[PDB]
Design a protein around this ligand. Sequence first.
Ligand code: HEM
Ligand SMILES: Nc1ccc2ccc(COc3cccc(CNCc4ccccn4)c3)cc2n1
Ligand SMILES: [Cl-]
Length: 362
Amino acid sequence: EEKEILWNEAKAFIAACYQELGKAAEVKDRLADIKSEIDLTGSYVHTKEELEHGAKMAWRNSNRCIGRLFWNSLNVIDRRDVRTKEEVRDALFHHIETATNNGKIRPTITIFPPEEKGEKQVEIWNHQLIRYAGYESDGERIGDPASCSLTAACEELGWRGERTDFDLLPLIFRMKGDEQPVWYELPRSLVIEVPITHPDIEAFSDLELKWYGVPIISDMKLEVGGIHYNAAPFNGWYMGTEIGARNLADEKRYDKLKKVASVIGIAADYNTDLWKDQALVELNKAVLHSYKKQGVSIVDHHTAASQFKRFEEQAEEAGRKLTGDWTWLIPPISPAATHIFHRSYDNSIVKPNYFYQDKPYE
Ligand code: HEM
Ligand SMILES: Nc1ccc2ccc(COc3cccc(CNCc4ccccn4)c3)cc2n1
Ligand SMILES: [Cl-]
């Protein structure tokens, strides 16, 4: 019905992939074998080398990612062999442990079986594997507002949170052929967390802030040569502004800037005092200090943009077009102090790539 879309994606991908692996001679025979396989079966199966390089290409093509200099060192874990809930659960546990690496974070992706002919083999409900619950009741707000809808789905299924501001959500996923997902609590031994302190202001610890070490995005689809890997969680390390300027600062997230102003001893009364700006800087200083003192990988937005400049230079030196989303590449703190702010970027979509997909809860 729709097999030729798959076949053409497969030609573009195999051509480009082998080219770069210095293997263009093997292309003609590999496309033959693929053409056979699609006719008989309706799909094809990537080699380990094709899958690893495809997931690396997909990171290199992610327009919104400032961290792409390191695209070629992605650790790719091939879990297309899993068939049971316990195997999925244990592969997700293993990803956390091996990506964390005692604080010296390793960018890692774990790839589960792809969609067969539209049908998902495994459907992950978490937005990240490690994330905090959020609650809204009696006009009383607890934890992370961005997690309210998933937290309510989890509690229909029999999970119950302690209603701290930092409850760890359970892993939640559904297998092909079950009506309902299963959930598993995270073993705390697997989860590194960082208390937020400030290098100079001893009272900052009175805020009792913390964040988790590793962001493991678990709800995006990886597409490589026409095959759709809807379950393929991946992680880098944080850039500090993600925690200090957004997760802990936004009014619709933890909304901590007024409390920060008070502990650093400035008034939060007049826009012209730039008290929100000053609080943002001190919170973001505290976040970088805290991760570094605990030995957990993190990058500041200036170093990150320096790395991205080198990515842009490599792309040219290799003859590849650069694509990028200016509105996501600029950092939310001092953007005009980076080179990114002062140039433009072509936002075209190149494949392999990571894509959004509809959430299964509401
Ligand atoms: C190694 C360290 C990494 C750093 C520091 C980094 C940094 C970032 C940042 C700051 C964003 C913006 C998110 C926001 O505004 O909150 C982002 C987006 C993104 N990153 Fe990276 N990243 C890294 C690794 C990775 C890896 C390993 C992949 C996949 C293999 C990846 C794929 C993406 C994608 C797809 C987006 C866009 C997500 C969306 O549209 O919602 N990144 N990255
Ligand atoms: N260290 C890392 C490493 C990898 C990452 C992969 C994906 C993401 C996803 O990130 C976001 C998703 C949704 C919303 C936001 C914040 N809104 C950004 C925005 C809004 C308006 C205008 C411009 N930008 C981020 C993060 C990763 N982080
Ligand atoms: Cl985050």
